[model samples]
Target: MAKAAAIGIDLGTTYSCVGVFQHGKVEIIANDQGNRTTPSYVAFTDTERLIGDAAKNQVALNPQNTVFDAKRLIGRKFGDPVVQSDMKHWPFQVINDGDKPKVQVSYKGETKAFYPEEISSMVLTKMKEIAEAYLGYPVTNAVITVPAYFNDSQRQATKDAGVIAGLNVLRIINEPTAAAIAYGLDRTGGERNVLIFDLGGGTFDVSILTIDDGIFEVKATAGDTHLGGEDFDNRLVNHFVEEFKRKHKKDISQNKRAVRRLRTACERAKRTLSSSTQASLEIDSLFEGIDFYTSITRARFEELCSDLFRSTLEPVEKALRDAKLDKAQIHDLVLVGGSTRIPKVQKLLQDFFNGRDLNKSINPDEAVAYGAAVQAAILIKSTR
Candidate 1:
């Protein structure tokens, strides 16, 4: 028997999701682990290759074998300045192949170089398997969403990933467009100006949109392609590294495990600072087998990340200007992406809008997938 659920996937940089449009509604498929959002990670071990949470958990302990944020490197050339600058932050090696960057990792007692698409395909394959389990059958047709700013090659790489995953990608929608589709359905028939402020883990994209009578048009888009939550996480890790070095009088620069440990600690602290006023960070044996303890207040965190937070405003202003629309003209200010959950981001948008409440009606993490599912339902030829 053939399954009929129209699958919609959001292939995110930091996380990924799968959705199914069923009987006039969208159901976000929870993986076997019971989570809708899965980490976009792949870890290679001596005996096996792991995906999702299993791979994500090892990112802090197996830096060389675990790959994260491949979306940023995929389809990009090594000649690019951003790639050159980013190479230093990663513990895994990215070797140059005819001006293009390819990741090389060691596992199973041998070093192997992998294409960016191959790594991404593994994640998609994992998602496909999970969806099959939930649906009780295999599904090959799907609609995938990507960043609004993805260029032609990047988009093709994503499609290639779908092919490698054994799924036929029906369409590739923009992340912001998918987000708007998710929230804009209920807002039909009115003229609305919207600004989608997206700050995910690997990139930041600002999309200005105008919606009217079921018509959705993108006015202008701008972003720092390389900026997002991961940048902030990197900042936190660097802070701890310097602090550890100063306190212990020992350098753990070459310690892959320590760097990964620092990354994990910073990520938790970053998320903690989102809601609470304080997030305590402690990673025993961070350097020279010495315990590290740091208590960070929200105020201090805001202070530390002020410049980064402020940097996001540039694209907002640029996008508005590009559209020739004033901030007051924006009737709807929609916040998208996981990083937008940071309280400071919400406050910034609110402040920009003169205390107008920013929209939180949609789940920031799942909206893209939900909207993709909506599109999928429209595309699926039939079901049996």
Candidate 2:
């Protein structure tokens, strides 16, 4: 029998997905729990470590102990501004031991220290295990995808995570470029210029590309490390706080637990509003003797997030400027990332592109992982 093919892993901010090359096509590897994508979360139990869905579900109850967005801490120093700013909002405590950043968490009545890479490596290792199980072979080789704007240090850090996870990190490809490869746009004759707009849970990036003859090259990329769907959720939380103060004569934002519950509700409402014209936000026992309930129209939600949508435009403009392409030069505008599900984003891109071709061929949620799998296939085939 032929050797099992290598896998590709997309380590995203909010979720992670694994894919493998098989039978002339790319296939995603489902977790033992039978999910295509795993939540990028980790938690320590009284006895053992847990990752993915179970860990994410435990976050609200054990916020301080559960770690999410370990990617933000990877390859960053203790004094980095991004780290310091994120520490203020993160439930986990970040401390400096010498000059490196370390996360301190309590587990089984004992405090434990972990480097960011260690936390990320745990997730990577789980993905490897899934691939190995599915292939009936120890899968060691893999391709990983990262944000297009990730710096040299961040790129090196991701490679390090793969190393610690015990997989031979085959290559670290930019997210947008990988997506283009997966789309097989290289087969299209003539000069094709495309824009990949990716807005993830915690990060946003816009990459411009030029493809020809099986070559997808990135012309330029721009983005913010701190902007994404989380910001939109926070805006909803702010609205809730104001509403609570006006109706119940209390500020719920000061109460951490209440804020957490509201934030979670906001995330759900945000998703619901995508399909429904109106979504409701209800929180019982939000604070001391307070219960909050309200309904938000999709229009109102879009109004609340208009600023965020506008903020994303700057990066698109910058990316286009860097690529020296105008709106007319773009052959296709492709959307990637969960945030693109918003109707406003689609409208905004449509207006920006002057009603040109907008490719919605790929599911925003799965495109990156699918692309990663395609790249994994390419790497495996090259080796033969």
Candidate 3:
């Protein structure tokens, strides 16, 4: 039987996840591993294409065949500035297919071109199945979220992906806007200014919104598509690569497998440093004859990323000016995104507010997807 209940999805640039409305509250749907958020990645495997966590795991090992960060590439032209920069930086091949950008990968043992929407559809299908399992049945309707900065073409492209996945997209909420809805600021019935500081795995976006009564409008937005948690990991990866070379005289990056393990270790250290004062990164035989081991203190990590962290403020300031808002006018600073969990970010955000505690209650990563679920329920009731 076709179920009437719909699921909400957060089709993020760095990760894609889904949630559902049940028991009168939003339930963040978990994947097989019980993780609320799953990586948005798809790998063209030998026999069958892999999606979600499996696809993500192959990124470093089988990079050429793995496609990722599709949300960043979707709904854009090959000549776009982002495509040009990403073509050189990504380990995989990103080639031009005539006039538009397409990923070149070995699918079915042959080099093939894949559009951004195709990759996104694979992730969407995975999300759809995961949601269906949680609901104990199949549901087709979905409300996916996109970045507020996404243009019409990009938005339309995402909808096209939805159709390919066999799911009807009821709406495409903005990422920052999704976070705002999740915060439920409008429920207070007060004129509150919302400053959404969203820092994700591969991008950072700031939005200035005004939530008064029922008029919740986005006034200004600013972001750096290149800046995100991945940058922090790269900083640690490169800084120590040189340090490891200086001490051992052997470059670990010389071995892709070794560098891959090093990257894994670095990600663990970054998460550990969030709560622990010092985190140690160790990879045995990171190269032909070198063992990599180092300790990263919170102080040193903060010092290294201080400039990067400060750069995020430029967009924050820029957004405020564009919205014609003063810092004091901000009523609540909504913290959304996985990287927002970093200690430096929380500390720095206090200065943006009144130096008081920020809204850390909303789960940084799951908030958008959960909000999507709430919105879907609202839409359902509105139509009924």
Candidate 4:
């Protein structure tokens, strides 16, 4: 049987989600692993390719073949300054293909160069499969959301990824615009100016939009393509690496497994520090059978990444300037993306807006996908 619902996908840097509008509501579909949002990680093994959680599970053992945050490199040329800078942080290999960047991985005992779009398509395919399983039918048409500041090449690459994943890709909307569509549906009578501050795992975007009745018009968008939650995580990782070197008098840079272990633990601690005042990291036999334990206060974390937290405002200021709207003109400051959960980010945003209460009514991680589903439904109705 054919389902009337179409899917919306939020193809994020660290995680991805799929949603469907049905019976007057947007329903997020959970994968077989019971996760509403799946890790956007893909790994190539000698025997098979792994996607989502499974792929991330073995990253320590297969960093060279595992790909995450393809969103950063997809549709970008190898010669681009940002691409060159980001490549240093990625464990996998990227080869230049006539100025275009292609990821090199070993698959089925053979080395292969895959386009960044292809890597993204694999994640999109996983999203499609999850939606299909939940809806009990195949879903071909979709609306995908991207960062508002994405260029033409990046936007085109996203559409191409949807096509490669067997999706129709009805539309490619801006992430903040999509968030506004999801947030504005409740009160549709008056004009409202909304500023969407989206800081995801690997990218940050800020967009200002004006909503009149039911129409959403984007005014301006800006962001740092290289800044996001992962960058903060990297800061913590490096801090601890330096700490480890001083304490143990040995460097673990050559030990991929040890670095991966620390990264995983540091990520957990980072999340913990989001809600709590202090978080601890305890890893048994961290290096050379040496027990490693450390704790960081939220204040310390805020101090460590203070610059990154402050840098977020540059885009906000630029967006407000481009829109020609004062900070007071923004009626509501909506927060999107997982990184917004950090207390420091929220407080800074609130302060930037002159103590305006940042809207927390929507799920930060899923709002973009939810808005995409709303758009998908609109597209379906229009077509009919």
Candidate 5:
């Protein structure tokens, strides 16, 4: 029997992952670089284009042409306050083209402009290729995951990107909902109240739901679109910049390349601080041909982003409030997204649940994709 293969895409703000259901299980597809998740980046050069890790690798050399965070700009107006604020940090130019924002880059020895959807389409195409190479078949249908709070325009823009990538988007599922699906809560009998805490690179979301006899019901969802791992990285970046200035008496804050490199180091440091008690940041020729090195304790890292860490709880409470459930009612607290690996976040979640253990059995990075793959398999079965 021949079966039509469909993929599940977690089109995230910082990184993207793809998965497909096969042989009674879901497999997260790795890119050519042997990475399970690819950086959500696109870069244009004089003679060639780059996506994923390759594009991110050359960010210091091609800051202006390396377009990342397209998910933030997609379907947003040029005059939107968030877009205006975000433009201040982006090295690339985002100018108003009519009412929409247009990204300008130098490509193929010529200047070019692209809408957010176009950039995202290129990313989707890369994901499609990754899945195709792994599955040994052509896949045209997918189930993409998005933030639950995404507006109509954002959803439409994502669908457009899928269309442009030559894939038929079977459904656009919510990130938290997808995480819930990945947790396999629906397989159990009776009603089980589940709360999904999704803290990815660029966004944070909390959703409350109940699962009973293969049926899932979302009671409430709340989140901060601006809070995530990137904000935690910003804290470390600022700390590093201040430390460099205090030691060398030189300010490299205005240097785009320096800040970009520093941001990468800080991001790595953030990941390190997750499992270890301390993490270090080091960069040679970081600014003005000088070397930079610093180490931070996990306590200090948590303190640096203390407010940000605490703020995540607000949405958790909000979701519980809207769902009319108390803390005790949540049968399980499922963690999703990369940021949830932070020990401090886990500690806080434990405290909130009165020392309850979190559900960390699944790979947080690939959980949504796994769930989406399951849903894709279900969809295919239903159609038949």
Candidate 6:
């Protein structure tokens, strides 16, 4: 008997997920570790290489070696503005070989070379293996989703990663469009206008979509590949460094160890602020005989990131204009992306739609993966 079919994979920058279709329903393929989502991180150790959860745990301890966010470098040329700027702050060293950028990680005290596609492929291969094991057959085909704004080169690079992972790339759907599919907007009766606000860890995308019958089409999509929650954390880190210099008369930004600690603290604080009205950060031994403590209010955070919030509006307006739809015509406003959890972002959308409902029923981080699975299931059966 032939094996059953599966459809899509969400190859996200910070996390990866797989999905399949079975018995007329879509299901996400669990990682070998039994988690629905896997971290897009990899680490090389002396004994063996570690991926996903295991690798994420070692990020702070081995900041200079563990590779994360390689998705940002995919298809980017050497000395690309983003690459050059990221090199100064990224935990791992990025080496340029002519037009291609590669990650250089220290394993067993020896530096090893790995292209972004290569690193992403390892994670993809792991997901494929997990899906195959669960399906009791060789899982070979998939429709991977990418940011709608990804350039041609980036899209090609993503397909290349799929090839390296041993997958027969069927289609590459836009992330926001995939989310709309998962929402069943296309399946609902009649036509509707919707806005998809996606704010992931490393990138931000706002897409306007139209749903008619079983067709989900993108009207317009806009985003900054470099803007996301990561940028917010970097801002906090810079503030901490400036404060430290003002108090101690010494620049701690130059200290890698200190900078790393501050970065970790900033990330933690950023997450904490999401649920709480205020968050506090304390870092011990960040400097010689000195400790740092700071408290941040949600309002203060919004003030600091006001420009970032404003930046998203331009895209929303552009998407609306391109789609020729008014905010009042939008039947549903959906928020996808972990960064959408930020209260300020929520408020911004609320204001823009002028009281239109923003759907928060689906988990922003998991929706894309779920949609990817739905597409995978469709493609699998259709191909057979």
Off by over 4 Å in 1: 1-3, 77-82, 96-100, 185-187, 234-263, 282-294, 381-384
What tens-digit string does per-residue lDDT give for candidate 5 at 1-384? 687688999998879999999888999999999999999899999989999999998887888999999998998999989899999989999989998998999999999999998999999999999999987888998999887777899999999999999998989888777887887777766788889988888788898988878777778889998888989999998988898989999999999889988998999999988889998888999999998888999999999999999998999899999999999999988999889999889988889989887888788999988899989888877766
- Candidate 6 local accuracy as lDDT? 0.83
Of candidates 4 and 2, the better by lDDT: 4
lDDT of 2 by residue, 141-221 (tens): 888888777789888888998999998888898888767766766567667898998888888888998887667778999
TM-scores for the candidates: 0.86, 0.91, 0.94, 0.91, 0.90, 0.84
> For residues 157-203, could you state the per-residue lDDT of candidate 1 as single tens digits?
99999999998888988887788888754356667788888888878
Highest-TM-score candidate:
3
Q: What is the lDDT of every predicted structure here? A: 0.84, 0.84, 0.84, 0.89, 0.89, 0.83
Residue 352 lDDT in candidate 2: 84
Each model's Cα RMSD:
3.2, 2.4, 2.0, 2.4, 2.5, 3.4
lDDT of 6 by residue, 287-376 (tens): 876888888888887777889887988888888888887778888888888888988889888998887778877778878877887877
Superposed model 6: Cα runs more than 4 Å off: 5-7, 21-35, 45-47, 60-65, 75-115, 132-138, 151-153, 241-252, 291-293
For model 4, residues 1-384, the per-residue Cα lDDT tens digits are: 544588999999889999999888999899989999999999999999999999988887898999998998988999999899989988999999999999999999999988999999999999999998998887889999988778899999999999999999899998888787777543668887889998988778898888887777889988887788888889899999999999899887788778888998988999999879999999898889989999899998899999999999999999999999989999878889889999999988998888998776778999989999989998978876
Worst 10 residues of 1 by lDDT: 183-192
User: Which residue pairs show backbone clashes in model 6?
Assistant: 6-376, 7-376, 7-377, 8-376, 19-373
Question: What tens-digit string does per-residue lDDT give for candidate 3 at 220-318?
Answer: 999898899988998888989899889988877777777778888888899999999999887877787667779989999888888999888899889
Model 4 TM-score? 0.91
RMSD of 5: 2.5
Q: Clash number for every model?
A: 0, 0, 0, 0, 0, 5
Name the 10 consecutive residues with the lowest summed lDDT in model 2: 181-190
Question: What is the Cα-based TM-score of model 3?
Answer: 0.94
